[PDB]
Amino acid sequence: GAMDPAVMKIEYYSQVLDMEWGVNVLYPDEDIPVLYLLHGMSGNHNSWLKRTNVERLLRGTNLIVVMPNTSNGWYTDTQYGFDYYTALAEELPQVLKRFFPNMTSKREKTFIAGLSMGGYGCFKLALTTNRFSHAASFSGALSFQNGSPAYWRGVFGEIRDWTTSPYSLESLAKKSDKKTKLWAWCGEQDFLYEANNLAVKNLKKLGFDVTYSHSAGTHEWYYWEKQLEVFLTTLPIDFKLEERL
Amino acid sequence: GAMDPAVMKIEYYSQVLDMEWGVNVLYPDDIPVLYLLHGMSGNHNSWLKRTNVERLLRGTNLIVVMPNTSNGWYTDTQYGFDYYTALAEELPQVLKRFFPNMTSKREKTFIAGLSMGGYGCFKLALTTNRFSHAASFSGALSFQNFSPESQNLGSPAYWRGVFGEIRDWTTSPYSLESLAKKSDKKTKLWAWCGEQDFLYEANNLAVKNLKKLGFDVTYSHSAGTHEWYYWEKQLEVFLTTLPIDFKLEERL
Amino acid sequence: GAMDPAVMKIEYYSQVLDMEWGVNVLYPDEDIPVLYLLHGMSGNHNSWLKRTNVERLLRGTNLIVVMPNTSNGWYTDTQYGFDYYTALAEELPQVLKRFFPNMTSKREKTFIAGLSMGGYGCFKLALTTNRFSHAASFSGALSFQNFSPESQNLGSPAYWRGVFGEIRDWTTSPYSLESLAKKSDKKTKLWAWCGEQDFLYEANNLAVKNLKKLGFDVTYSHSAGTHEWYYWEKQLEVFLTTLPIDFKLEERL
Amino acid sequence: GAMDPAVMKIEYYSQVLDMEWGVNVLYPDEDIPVLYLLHGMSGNHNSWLKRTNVERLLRGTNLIVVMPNTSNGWYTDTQYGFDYYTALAEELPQVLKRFFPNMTSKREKTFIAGLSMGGYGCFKLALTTNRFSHAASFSGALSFQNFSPESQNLGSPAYWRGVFGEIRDWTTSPYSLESLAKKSDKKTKLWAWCGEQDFLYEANNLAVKNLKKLGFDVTYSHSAGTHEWYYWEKQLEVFLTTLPIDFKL
Ligand SMILES: [Ca+2]
Ligand SMILES: [Ca+2]
Known part of the structure; x- marks a missing residue:
């Protein structure tokens, strides 16, 4: 309907991945704000569309939403020749800005x-x-300090200590100017609750602006959608939630 | 994920419409079937675009079929598009083959x-x-006491395209009351409408008339307007009335 | 692959149609030229992608291709309240310019x-x-003066009335290309092909004759051929070679 | 139109890959024959639909066509934990049989x-x-004994290791068609075409020669052509004429 975002289902060639690849875009209604919206393991670019009311949530909101695909590659340039980090951090933004x-x-x-x-x-x-400027994690896999062996090796190689490896958020934080607002939620009954506690505590110590919340909840889409709703209210985009009598 | 429905987006040729046409189907991981119908301005993508029906169906042994009537009111129109025949007769035959x-x-x-x-x-x-079960969420169930121009919906030519000239809705062949003559009364009818919906009085009238005709109608109403949030919630309630052992997701 | 166009399946809302609607876009892999590519009766915005190799054809070509949907409404603001002409001639270009x-x-x-x-x-x-600047018709339904849908039993009386109302005489109706020509500045290069074994061949001959009489720039070609996708694909290939876009046909040894 | 195949674009969960995954199906519109139609490198389940007139080709043909996705994984259970062979050889047929x-x-x-x-x-x-019963290769990468992907700027050392591990000699490796042929009962008719100007021409010549030597029923053709979709579409047409489906043109 009127004020609902247009939906772009995009098939594009990734030179980085040497593959015909996919992304979905929600386009409002110029310097239009953009939100990158990332799927979890077993997911892809269709995940947020299949698993939430993000389309309804974006009604009347001046915000472009970009959903990339990392296909179980952990947003990482992998040991097996698939440069997912490069494809999504560098190539996708260039491709989309051209369109x-x-x-x-x-x-x-x-x-x-x-x-x-x-x-x-x-x-x-x-x-x-x-x-x-703003970055949000919902029940994120934020630390491995506390699949299959071949699978995990394909992503991260051999890992002795997670936190001191170049793959930890603690180690990656060295690349940061610390000018990004970080926002995190985790369910208190989530198997990743303790990993979130450790990562948040570390990032705060390293001098990062981290807004961490936690409440009743488990590792399920209902909660992730609810927390996206909360995260959107923190953005400079004048978001309004639908009426719910 | 595991237990989530498969989604198939189907391109098929409608001989009835003499059109390339489409439908979406959710297929679970003698299987029951729910036909799920879109509203005005909508199409076969509407329920998938506007609700969490996909997530709702996780672990549920139910095929969901989403047809498209393209603003044609599930009616064999005055302008040569037989949408009723296409969706009532042709689509079930096509899907049974697959x-x-x-x-x-x-x-x-x-x-x-x-x-x-x-x-x-x-x-x-x-x-x-x-x-066996049929549900309406804020349904346009009567035009006797509701006029689409009160909500700037369509246009005289558009409405004539669907229904022809209508002198009296209820006594016309298009009313649910008139269409009820074809019914054996053995379908459970289920309806909800929001008390702040423009169609609230249309629902009240149609429900009273169908009940007076001896139909089994379960009608509920509560706070609410003409919005997807409510229709999704009421689909959830309706699913609990079906012989399908449906269980709602955890919501702490 | 590299040099292949990106494909955009677009779900957008048509205010003109009061409909969720759709179009497909091929976007080359900056003032980029654009071709609007229209489907025929019984088809939709998927037709050219489903029925031809247009996608393979556009490899390495700096041309955006837009495939709209008129859903059997004849690119016409119909008698039954669907303004397909306004939706496709006016609204769609505005929607696309914005994206x-x-x-x-x-x-x-x-x-x-x-x-x-x-x-x-x-x-x-x-x-x-x-x-x-350039407009191409492949086996087009360019006149109903000397062509009737009753010849092949296309549609139905109610269907044709839905599109055009009651027509006394096609050529003198506001729907004829001859009537519509009055709105033209005559600066468009018109291009038409029709197969000689097409039910529409004489309709093409007549429309072309009439438009040329009115002083239009019309290039018309015809050869053995029938009302089939094989020919429409072949004629699209020919048309692309005429456009100011540096098109090159794939190797076929 | 009348007689054209229905198309279903399928999103399904692959337990084997622990992935939401995809396949396309053309369904003729009762024991219906099935063709699995496989994409090449850089492609996916959409490849044959995007790159050929396969839909038009199948008009009036009683044949289901299944297009799987192996996403640059070589239809192989890889060294990096993605079981593409098992997902496509075992899981997909079970999934589709259910639908x-x-x-x-x-x-x-x-x-x-x-x-x-x-x-x-x-x-x-x-x-x-x-x-x-019948299997066809169009400009297939049928051997790496005499072809190195590097010559065509294909992949990278890490990429090829991810698929095949370290390979001393291709033909004697368990990954060669010659080695894989040990698992065959030889009761499948093999069909192959390659362009005489294709960079894979010599790889085809070698694999065909070897499979023939091993006692396989191999119908091999070659003619003018390069590594392009135009040829693969034409050769799919020829292959269809060899199938017990009364294909027409
Ligand atoms: Ca959805
Ligand atoms: Ca295609």
């Missing part, structure tokens, strides 16, 4: 959010690029 | 719709006698 | 093409908008 | 074809499963 010149190129209007694996990817991209 | 494991039993065959889709839902239930 | 500012807004680089019902729609939009 | 009970479960009505990487994957599935 959509009215999308903002300003940090203060560029945001990121993800759930689980996407929570890790979100914080990683926020810390390494310095191109985002 | 999906032989879909039930052919009335007791396992259901339909639901919102607004124009609530009208279409009750029309199909009353005319076919092939459904 | 794609790098798409050209110049007549010199804006083109249109269509098969059958889409050939009619193509010439109609070319004549009435003055926004296109 | 479509009218699809054949007979070997004599089950066929497979692929281009490039898909030619390799096709012959691999045919040799290993013994569940197909």
Whole structure:
């Protein structure tokens, strides 16, 4: 309907991945603000569309939403020759800006959010690029300090100590100018609650602006959507939630 | 994920419409079937675009079929598009060919719709006698006491395209009351409307008339307007009335 | 692969149609030329992608291709309240300009093409908008003066009345290309092909004759051929070689 | 139109890959024959739909066409934990059989074809499963004994290691079609075409020679052509004429 976002289901060639690849875009209704919205493990670019009311949530909101695909590659340039980090941090923004010149190129209007694996990817991209002003993690896999062996090796190689490896958010934080607002939620009955506690505590000590919340909840889409609703209210976009009598 | 429905987006040729046409189907991980009908301005993508129906169906043994009537009111129109025949007769035949494991039993065959889709839902239930349960969410269930111009909906030519010239709605062949003559009364009818919906009085009237005709109608109403948030909530309630062992997601 | 166009399946709201609606876009891999490519009766915005190799054809070509949907409404503001002409001639270009500012807004680089019902729609939009430099019809339904849908039992009386109302005489009705031509500045290069074994061949001969009499720039070609996708695909290939876009046909040894 | 195949674009969960995954199906519009149609490198389940007139080709043909996705994984259970072979050889057919009970479960009505990487994957599935009666390769990557991907700027050392591990000699490796052929009952008709100007021409010549030596029924053709979709579409047409489906043109 009127005020609902247009939806762009995009098939594009990734030179970085040497693959025909996919992204979804929600386009409002120029310097239009952008939110990158990252899926978790087992997911892809369709996840937020399949698993939440993000479309309804974006009604009347001047915000472009970009949903990338990392296909179980952890937003990482992998050991097996698939450069997912490069494809999504570098190539995708270039591809989209070419299609959509009215999308903002300003940090203060560029945001990121993800759930689980996407929570890790979100914080990683926020810390390494310095191109985002706000970054949100919902039940993120924020630390491995506390699949299959071949699978995990494919992502991270051999890991002795997670926190001191270049893959930890603590280590990636060294690349950050610390000017990104970080936002995190985790359910208190989530298996990743303690990983979130450790990562948040570390990032705060390292001097980062981290707004961490936690409440009753488990590792489920209902909660991640609810927390996206909360995160959107923190953005400079004048968001309004639907009436719910 | 595991237990989530498969989604198939189907491009098929409608011989009835003489059109390339489309439908969406959710297929679970003699399987019951729910036909889920869109409203005005909508199409076969509406329920997927506007609700968490996909997430709602996790772990539930139910095929969901989403047809498209493209603003044609689930009606064989005045302008040569036989949408009723295409969706009531052709689509079920097409899908049965693809999906032989879909039930052919009335007791396992259901339909639901919102607004124009609530009208279409009750029309199909009353005319076919092939459904056991039929639900309307803020349905356009009568035009006797509701005029679309009060809400700047369509135009005189558009309405004439669907229904022709209508002197009196209820006594016309298009009313649910008139269409009810084709019904064996053995379909459970289920309706909700928000008390702040422009269609509240239309629902009140149609429900009273169908009950007076001896239909089994379960009508509920509460705070609410003409919005997707409510239709999604009421689909959730309706699913609990079906013989499908549905359980809602955890919400702490 | 590399050099292949990106494909955009677009779900947008049409205020004109009061509908959730759709279009497909091929976007080359900056004032980029655009071709609007119109489907025929029984088709939709998916037709050219489903029924031809247009995607493979556009490899390495700097041209955006827009495939709209008129859903059997003849690119016409109908008698039953669906304003397909306004939706496609007016609203769609505005919607696309907003999404794609790098798409050209110049007549010199804006083109249109269509098969059958889409050939009619193509010439109609070319004549009435003055926004296109080149317009191509493939086996177009260019006249109903000497063609009747009753010859092949296409549609139904109610269907045709739904599109055009009651017509005494096609050529003198406001729906004819001959009537619609009055809105044209005559600056569009019109291009038409029709197969000699097509039910629409004489309709093409007549429309072409009439438009040339009115002083239009019309290039008309015909050869053995029938009312089939094989021919429409072949003629699209020919049309692309005529456009100011550096098109090169794939190798076929 | 009338007689054209229905198209279903399918999103399903792959337990084997722990992925939301995809396949396309053309369904003719009862024991219906099935063709698995495999994409090449850089492609996916959409490849044959995007790059050919396969839809038009199948008008009036009683054949289901299944297009899987191996996402640059070479139809192989990889060294990095993605079991593409198992997902496509075992899981996908079980998934589709559940949706479509009218699809054949007979070997004599089950066929497979692929281009490039898909030619390799096709012959691999045919040799290993013994569940197909006819298998076709179009410009297939049928051997790496005499072809190095580096010559065409394809992949990277890390990429190839991810698929095949370290390879001292291709033909004697368990990954070669020659080695995979040990699992075959030889009761699958193999069909191959390659362009005489294709960079994979010599790889085809070698694999065909070897499979013939091993006692396989291999129909191999070659003519003018390069590594392009135009040729693969034409050759799919020729392959269809060899199938027990009364294909028309
Ligand atoms: Ca959705
Ligand atoms: Ca295609």
